[PDB]
Design a binder for this molecule. Structure first.
Ligand code: NA
Ligand code: NA
Ligand code: NA
Lengths: 221, 225, 217
C-alpha cells in the first residue's frame, strides 16, 4: 500500500581473490586492483547507493555497475536480478569489508517506496548526505558533497523532477533519460543536504500526485 | 483472432508549465519551448503516429519519443507502458491542444492488427496520408508528404519489407533494425498516397503469410536431415 | 535438473530472393549478396554458433545477427524468440544450404546446460574447434582458429570467466559485458583446441559452484 517500503534483496555475492590479467584488461582495471567483489540484487538504484557507501568504508573502487533490461521481475535466471556491481580493492580482506558495508546498507531501511494501493507505482527519493567516490564521480561533483537520488517510472520522473527542481535549491547533475535498462528514469541532483532532502520530499509528493491522478491535465496552468 | 484490431490505451498524461531551465537543458529544448506535454501509452508506434498528428493540430514540436525495453506486456509499473512522448510548445494552452489531439488520435480506431488466432503475432501497416513535422523530419521528407509506417516482429518485418518495396513505387526513409526496444522492426517508406497504400497492403499480406506458415522450409527443403 | 540440456528451438525460417536494393543498402550487403536466409530461434548463442558453422557448410556470410531484449521467455510475439540471424549468398540454393546447416547444428545436441534443480541457472560452454567467418570476425581473430564460447548469467559469468582464464593458456578476445540483450554475460576465449576445452570445463564447474552457493563469500 501507499508509503510502504519495497524491500530490496541481495541475490549473490562472490570474491575473486587475484584477478587474471585478461579480465583486468577487459574491465579496464588499474594495476593496484588485485581483488574483485561481485554482487547482484533485485534493486539497482539501492545497490548503486550501497556500492558508493562501501567506498567510504573501505579501500574499494566501484569498477563496474550495470542494470538488467526490463527489471528484476523479468529476470530469466535466479541470480541475475536487475543489477551487477563490482568492487575492486588491494586484497580479499578489503574487498570483503567493502562488500559487508554494501550488504549492510542494502538492508538498512533504504528502498523504493510505493505510491499506490497495489504497489504498481513506486519511486526512489534518497538523500545521500556525503557521497563516496562512485556517485560523486558519476554526478561530476566533489567527493563528499550531497545528492538527491531520484528515480521513478518515465512520466512520473519527468513531472516530479520538474517539481523537485522548482521546490529545492539544487542543481542538475546526471539525467537518467527514459528508459534506463529497467524502464525507469530520474536524476542525480546536488546541493546542500537540506536542499537535497527538500528535493526528495517534493519528488515523492509529485510522483504520488501522478499516481492519484494519472490522466488529469486540463486544470489552469 | 486474425484481422482483429488491437486496441491501444493511453496510461498517463500531464503538463509541465514553465519548464525549469535545468530540464530544458537536458531535453535539449529550443528557447521558445516554455511548456511540456507528457504522455505514456501501451503501444509505441500508434503513439508516435498520434504525436505527429498533434504537430498538425497545435503549435507543438515532438521533442522526446522513446520506447520501453521488452514492450508493454513486460512493464513493471502501471504507467510506464511501452512509450513516453513529450510535446513542447510556447504555452500550456498550445501543449494542452496538442495533447488533446494526441489522445483523440490514439482512440480513433487505429491500432496494430492481429495475424493469428490468439493475437500472438501482430503488425502495423498504417498509411500516413499527410505527415506533420515530427514524422516528416524523422523520414527526411517534406511536411505533408505520405508515408507507409510498417512494423512487425523481426523476421516477419524483414520478409514483409522486401515484399512491400517490390510491390510499390516507394522509397526507404527510416529503417527500424531488429530489435527496437520492444523487439519489433520495420520502416518508414515514402511515395504517392496510392504507392504508400500499396506498400501497406503488401506488407500486411506478407506478415500474415509468415504467421500462417513460419516453418514451411522444413518440409520443402530440410527433408532427409 | 542439473546437467540437463536445454533444447534450443527454431521458430521461423524464410528466404528472400533478389533482395531489393533498398534493403541491401540498409543491411550493408555486398554486390554478390543476391539472396537472404532468415531465421529466428529461442536461444541466441546456440544460433550464433550455428550461423558460424553455416559459413563452413555453404557459400554464405552472416550479415545480420542480433539478440532480443530480456530473452525468449519475455518475447511478446510468437516468432521473435531471442535472436534473428540473416545469411546472405549468391543464390537461393546457397542460402537454403546455409540454413540447412544452421538447422542441423542447432539440432546437433549443443545447448545451454542447467546448473540446478529447476533449471533457473544455466550456462553455455561450447568449444568451437574451427571457426568459420562469423565468430572469427566478432572475436577479432584469424579465421579457422579455435574458441571457447562461454555464457552465463552476470555474476556467474564473471566468476567463471576468472576460473576459465586461470585453467588454461587462453586469451579473452571478445567480452560480452553484462547485460547482453538477454541479460547474460560471458566471452569468446581463444587458444589451442585443448586449452579451449579446458577453459570450457573450468567455466562449467565454476558456474555450478556459484549455483550451489550463491551467497557464500
Ligand atoms: Na531550485
Ligand atoms: Na522499385
Ligand atoms: Na515478463
Amino acid at each position: 500500500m501507499k508509503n510502504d517500503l519495497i524491500r530490496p534483496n541481495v541475490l549473490s555475492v562472490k570474491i575473486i581473490s587475484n584477478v587474471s590479467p585478461e579480465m583486468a584488461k577487459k574491465l579496464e582495471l588499474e594495476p593496484h586492483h588485485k581483488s574483485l567483489g561481485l554482487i547482484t540484487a533485485d534493486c539497482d538504484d539501492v545497490t548503486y547507493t550501497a556500492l558508493d557507501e562501501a567506498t567510504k568504508a573501505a579501500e574499494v573502487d566501484v569498477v563496474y555497475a550495470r542494470s538488467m533490461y526490463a527489471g528484476a521481475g523479468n529476470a530469466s535466471t535466479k541470480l541475475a536480478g536487475e543489477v551487477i556491481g563490482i568492487l575492486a580493492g588491494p586484497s580479499p580482506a578489503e574487498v570483503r569489508s567493502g562488500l559487508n558495508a554494501t550488504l549492510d546498507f542494502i538492508d538498512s531501511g533504504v528502498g523504493f517506496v510505493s505510491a499506490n494501493e497495489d504497489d504498481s507505482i513506486c519511486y526512489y527519493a534518497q538523500c545521500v548526505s556525503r557521497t563516496g567516490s562512485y556517485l560523486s564521480k558519476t554526478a561530476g561533483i566533489r567527493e563528499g558533497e550531497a545528492l538527491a537520488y531520484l528515480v521513478a517510472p518515465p512520466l512520473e520522473a519527468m513531472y516530479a523532477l520538474d517539481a523537485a527542481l522548482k521546490a529545492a535549491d539544487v542543481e542538475m547533475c546526471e539525467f537518467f533519460a527514459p528508459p534506463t535498462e529497467t524502464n525507469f528514469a530520474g536524476a542525480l541532483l546536488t546541493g546542500s543536504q537540506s536542499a537535497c532532502k527538500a528535493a526528495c520530499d517534493a519528488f515523492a509528493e509529485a510522483v504520488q500526485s501522478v499516481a492519484s491522478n494519472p490522466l488529469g491535465f486540463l486544470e489552469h496552468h
